[PDB]
């Protein structure tokens, strides 16, 4: 929960700390994440791209963030074979669902 | 005036300067002929302050040298292949190994810890024989810093160590952390006759150590097994 | 004492080339040396959400909200031209032989025991059965994977090129030969004799395989499908990409190789499903299941260990399976 | 009394370039100057699970679930154009000479002692035997490692280029000469004479080696393989990289140099296993074994020390081995591992 809150706070601080949204040259997957996790469509961004980002909230960005978090946490078959690792996976899924809900409520 | 911490030396730089209005001096930390760090320290510093200015670099060098020259590990596995039952840190390889994968033909196998494993099947009595023969002392990593020709068992190629090599193991700054008095009592000598060994140059009243005393001292300190 | 080696790798035999694709009209197939090549092109597609979405969603407002999304993508596609009814593919393959020896090993005694084991297998019976299976799989056009269904008449031409010019020739019909069983025929026996001579190392073999398939005019052909990087947007072939040698659609060589070794009939669980491609834990990714399940003592590894170490040589069909797996090649280490 | 030096180093002789590849059709072999290069491409690969498994695995549900999620790789590959059947390989070679002199030393007495040792060797035997074995390894196309196997016919031309033009020429059939033995032949003897002249410091030699190998149409070739480094990858990256100079597939120069010095037939293990490359503790990596183990008295260091310090000259083939190891160059002394 502290990691999820720190990630949400760092995303909010990076968003509000950003003065303007610039078209990143070669930001590989950074535009796909920053359609929602980036700032509003300013004059540097296209209005049609801003309307498309308002059309679809970044659920796939939340999936990629959950994948990066699950890759950051070292897992093994002892958690898959044990029930405690299944409970930890269920708790991580509940935290990822809460983070995706908080992202989708502000998104769009 | 230099300061000596085991095989390390800390010297000042013979003409100071004024930094921020206060007089200072440059200091250098050596490891034999190799210079490692340089700091600029003010005066009105006791030698303990100059010691723990560099203590952290000394400790980091010790950590890296301990990890690099660590001995090899063998392990005992049952017939499946996983679930290691016991481990041992050897100083040599048992000379009969050749790359193996354990099967159900035998209930005990003795594999290496490196990844393309070599292995051998054993029967828990020869395993104890190999553990008695090939084990390693607790401070075997100090042998990685020694020239080898002062470590051989053959008397024809051996040469006595110098004082700088001898400060690796004896003295309060050494890696074993044993005194000269305790090492003299370990050999059944006086403190003065042992201090005769560590003078610095044989012209200035200094004698070489014997073959037998050197190997027995390495045995008693837990550095080389010396069977 | 003797134990199995820890690193062990075998270089493959039966290397195919890549399968280039050309097109033309039927009964010009005695002059198919200047036929033009098929070209991959671009296409746009705007479809609907046809997937099984998450049920117990009693909200059709989000449903017809999602209906108004055209979700346009851009699709690579390659088709036959308007004036051609016949598709022509072409590749070469060589047979190497010396299929006993590994390419890397740790132990020497294990390697010598393995060498004398395959020597006993060869002196018992040569490569005649396996080359019969391989020539049979070569005769029917199995390597055309999805370009074989819905075909009128498929004819393959085989050339054994000893010098720069052709030495011998075959000419088969595909659909007479089944994709199910292994029969006998004198031309097939001559081809299997040549392949078994190549696998024994008695002489080198270079083959050239050309096929013709009368699909019709303007239909769609299927080359191999590439990998799409998700770092881009919804444009730039965001759907699929087709494999191509320079300005020509083509098929990957491992597709040809997987089609050629589809000879495993001795898998125990059934027999009415036809032959399988040979590999340890004999499995197919289309069915998503694994025959030769290793808790049954019929995988490649346990059979090989019981053969080489304890000298419990299995039944002759399982020995065929093991030697075919060694002809496939791979990495057999821990 | 005379001990060994603490620092010793020898630069190498027999310096090759790195060879690059090209393609064409046979019987255009005498016009092969505009034959285009062989480039590298990429392709996708989906693989199965085909390796051994641990015992906590092989519960069949876990195995099937492993088969469910596949792995997708990208791979560099290189192969012939679809209308050619001959591969062309080209590189140059310098024989330097002066093999006795070290590049760094401490004892002068050790230096001139081994200098007079190699002078006595070069007075007794010439460089004829080693140059014969070297010209043998140049004759057969051993430097084609995997491109040689399964080939139909292979022909190699050498040009001795002295000024800006050719001086002498050689032609061979590489599969006539075996990879198993060392015969005699007049043209090969002239080539070995030229090489032994270059090794002895007599003249200045520079060769150009061209090889033609008949493979087939569209078939795969094998360049050297690079090393990829990635720190916690995302399982969609490449898994194979090939060496290329200026967009043309190529072989590393040390691969050629390792193939050239495959002349050790004198190792005490056996004789039906073929010659290996000259090494201290002479070891091949495919077998994972070390011939000339130092517990036998047949490694490079003990032979050298018995020859130099205590004058036990070994057998003449061991002297050939030691001189070959000195021609190879390396680092000896108290930089020990």
From TrEMBL, chain A:
The lineage of its organism: Bacteria, Pseudomonadati, Pseudomonadota, Gammaproteobacteria, Pseudomonadales. It comes from the Bacteria. This is Uncharacterized protein. It comes from Pseudomonas aeruginosa. The chain holds residues 327 to 434 of 434 of the full protein.
């Amino acid at each position: 929960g502290q990691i999820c809150d720190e990630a949400l706070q760092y995303a909010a601080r990076l968003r509000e700390l950003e003065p303007g949204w610039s078209a990143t040259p070669g930001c590989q997957l950074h535009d796909a994440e920053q359609l929602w996790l980036d700032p509003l469509r300013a004059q540097t961004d296209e209005t049609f791209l801003q309307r498309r980002l308002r059309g679809d909230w970044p659920a796939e960005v939340g999936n990629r963030f959950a994948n990066w978090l699950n890759r950051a946490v070292s897992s093994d078959s002892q958690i898959l074979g044990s029930p405690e690792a299944a409970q930890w996976s269920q708790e991580l899924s509940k935290e990822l669902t809460m983070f995706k809900e908080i992202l989708e409520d502000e998104r769009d | 005036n230099a300061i000596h911490i085991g095989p390390f030396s800390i010297t000042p730089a013979a003409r100071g300067l004024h930094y921020g209005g206060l007089p200072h001096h440059q200091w250098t930390l050596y490891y034999g002929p190799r210079e490692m760090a340089i700091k600029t320290l003010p005066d009105s510093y006791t030698s303990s302050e100059v010691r723990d200015e560099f203590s952290d670099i000394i400790a980091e060098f010790v950590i890296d040298a301990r990890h690099r020259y660590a001995p090899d590990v063998l392990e005992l596995v049952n017939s499946d292949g996983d679930a290691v039952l016991a481990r041992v840190a050897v100083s040599r390889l048992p000379e009969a190994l050749s790359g193996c994968i354990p099967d159900d033909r035998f209930p005990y196998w003795l594999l290496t810890a490196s990844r393309p494993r070599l292995g051998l099947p054993v029967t828990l009595n020869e395993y104890t024989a190999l553990a008695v023969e090939l084990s390693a002392p607790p401070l075997a990593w100090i042998t990685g810093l020694l020239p080898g020709e002062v470590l051989t068992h053959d008397a024809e190629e051996w040469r006595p160590p110098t004082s700088w090599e001898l400060r690796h193991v004896v003295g309060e700054g050494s890696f074993t952390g044993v005194s000269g008095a305790a090492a003299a009592a370990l050999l059944g000598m006086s403190a003065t006759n042992f201090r005769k060994y560590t003078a610095g140059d044989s012209a200035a009243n200094r004698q070489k150590i014997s073959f037998a005393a050197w190997h027995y001292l390495l045995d008693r300190l837990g550095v080389k097994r010396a069977s | 004492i003797l134990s199995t080696a820890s690193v062990l790798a075998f270089e493959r035999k039966l290397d195919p080339s890549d399968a280039l694709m050309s097109a033309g009209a039927w009964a010009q197939r005695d002059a198919s040396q200047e036929w033009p090549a098929v070209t991959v092109r671009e296409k746009s597609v705007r479809g609907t959400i046809s997937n099984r979405l998450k049920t117990k969603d009693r909200d059709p407002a989000k449903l017809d909200a999602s209906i108004q999304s055209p979700n346009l993508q851009t699709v690579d596609v390659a088709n036959l031209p308007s004036d051609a009814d016949t598709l022509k593919v072409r590749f070469t393959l060589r047979v190497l032989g010396g299929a006993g020896t590994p390419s890397a090993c740790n132990d020497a005694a294990y390697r010598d025991k393995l060498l004398q084991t395959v020597a006993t297998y060869v002196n018992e019976q040569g490569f005649a059965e396996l080359a019969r299976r391989y020539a049979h799989n070569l005769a029917n056009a199995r390597f055309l994977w999805r370009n074989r269904v819905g075909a009128e008449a498929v004819e393959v031409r085989i050339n054994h090129i000893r010098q720069g010019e052709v030495a011998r020739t075959w000419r088969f019909d595909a659909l007479a030969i089944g994709l199910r069983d292994f029969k006998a025929d004198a031309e097939l026996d001559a081809l299997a004799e040549l392949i078994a001579s190549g696998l024994s190392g008695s002489g080198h073999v270079l083959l050239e395989v050309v096929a013709f398939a009368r699909i019709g005019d303007g239909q769609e052909v299927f080359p191999s499908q590439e990998l799409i990087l998700d770092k881009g947007d919804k444009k730039g072939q965001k759907s699929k990409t087709l494999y191509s040698v320079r300005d020509a659609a083509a098929i990957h060589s491992q597709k040809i190789g997987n089609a050629l070794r589809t000879i495993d009939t001795w898998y125990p669980d059934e027999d009415g499903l036809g032959p399988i491609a040979v590999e340890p834990y004999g499995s197919v990714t289309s069915q998503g299941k694994a025959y030769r399940q290793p808790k049954q003592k019929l995988d490649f590894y346990t059979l090989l260990d019981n053969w080489v170490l304890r000298d419990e040589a299995p039944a002759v069909e399982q020995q065929h399976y093991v030697i075919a797996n060694l002809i496939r090649g791979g990495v057999f280490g821990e």
